[PDB]
Amino acid sequence: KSSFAKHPSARKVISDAAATVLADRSYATSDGIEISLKPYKFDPDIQPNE
């Protein structure tokens, strides 16, 4: 939708910038998520509302 509808080179530069940032942060997010889920793996206690 942006002003970069045309210019596939500039557009793909933007896209690849997003891609390289996400790729950089991906590992820390995955490992942190497994650590944070470590308690619910052992006992995913279910409350009546859930």
Next chain:
Amino acid sequence: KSSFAKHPSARKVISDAAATVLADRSYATSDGIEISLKPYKFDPDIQPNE
């Protein structure tokens, strides 16, 4: 309340064993807790029921 009410030396051995296990896990527990709290440090948004 245990059978080791007397024999304070062996009792101390048991107590110190508990203390050393707890000491071994203390840091990993703390760091994991701070990682799990990482989202609430940024924005601890409060639900109406809370």
Next chain:
Amino acid sequence: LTNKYYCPEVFLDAVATKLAQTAVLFLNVEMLNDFYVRFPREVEAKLHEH
């Protein structure tokens, strides 16, 4: 809850309860469960060596 800055007491108590409960889950799994499993082994070894 919309006037949080007008009611700091209830807000701070909500934050405290939340941090406390999620920290309690990670604590129970990691530290507590590791204690239940490692403690007897440590008692046996240290008592025998003593």
